[model samples]
Target chain A: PPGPPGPPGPPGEKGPPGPPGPPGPPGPPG
Target chain B: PPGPPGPPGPPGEKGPPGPPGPPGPPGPPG
Candidate 1:
């Protein structure tokens, strides 16, 4: 699974541009 | 690690176009 990269939340909606990867290494923590 | 294929940023001002998955592996690096 992908993990690492945390902190920074409360900001949803408006996500559909395509190919928005790279800076997404946070998921499992709490 | 779906890497390779970078460079090409800047250009965020248009949204609206989702609900189309099941293609392959993309969007996970930004």
Candidate 2:
């Protein structure tokens, strides 16, 4: 009783790479 | 002849942070 809406399913799988902060405040001493 | 596939659309917006190079070899002179 409701068909006709299939054209949008293929774009989700790119979120896993955000963990490396806290090491950028020791310069200008050389 | 196709209207029963719509339950997966909410995860695509986390990719934009890759351009901070060329400034890591000058942090050991302070």
Candidate 3:
């Protein structure tokens, strides 16, 4: 699954570690 | 039908989109 991952963005200030994002929905059913 | 297409015919070829490409099976089959 490893293809060109998007280009890297500029480094950012160490903002308070972002709150853990909510878990994503499960992947499409097999 | 054909043998596994015969190492991919040397890299740069960019060969045609494989023959008998699997229907929407695109990548791999389950």
Best by lDDT: 2
How would you encode candidate 1's per-residue C-alpha lDDT over B1-30 as one tens digit per residue? 654544544455545756544444543443
For candidate 3, give the lDDT of residue A9. 44
Segments of candidate 1 deviating more than 4 angstroms: A1-30, B1-13, B23-30
**lDDT rank, highest first?**
2, 1, 3
lDDT of each candidate versus the true structure: 0.49, 0.61, 0.36
Q: Provide the global lDDT of candidate 1 against the true structure.
A: 0.49
Candidate 2 lDDT over B1-30, as tens digits, reads 668776676687686555444433355543
TM-score per candidate, in order? 0.14, 0.27, 0.21
Which candidate has the top score in DockQ? 2
Model 3 in CAPRI terms: which quality? incorrect
For residues A4-28, what per-residue lDDT tens digits would candidate 2 score against the true structure?
A: 7766676787776555444454456
Ranking by DockQ: 2, 1, 3
Q: State the weakest 10-residue window (summed lDDT) of model 3 chain A.
A: A12-21
Give the distance in Å from residue B4's predicted Cα in candidate 3 to where it truly belongs: 87
Per-residue lDDT of A1-30 in model 1, one digit per residue for the tens? 444444444444575655433443444545
DockQ of each: 0.05, 0.30, 0.02
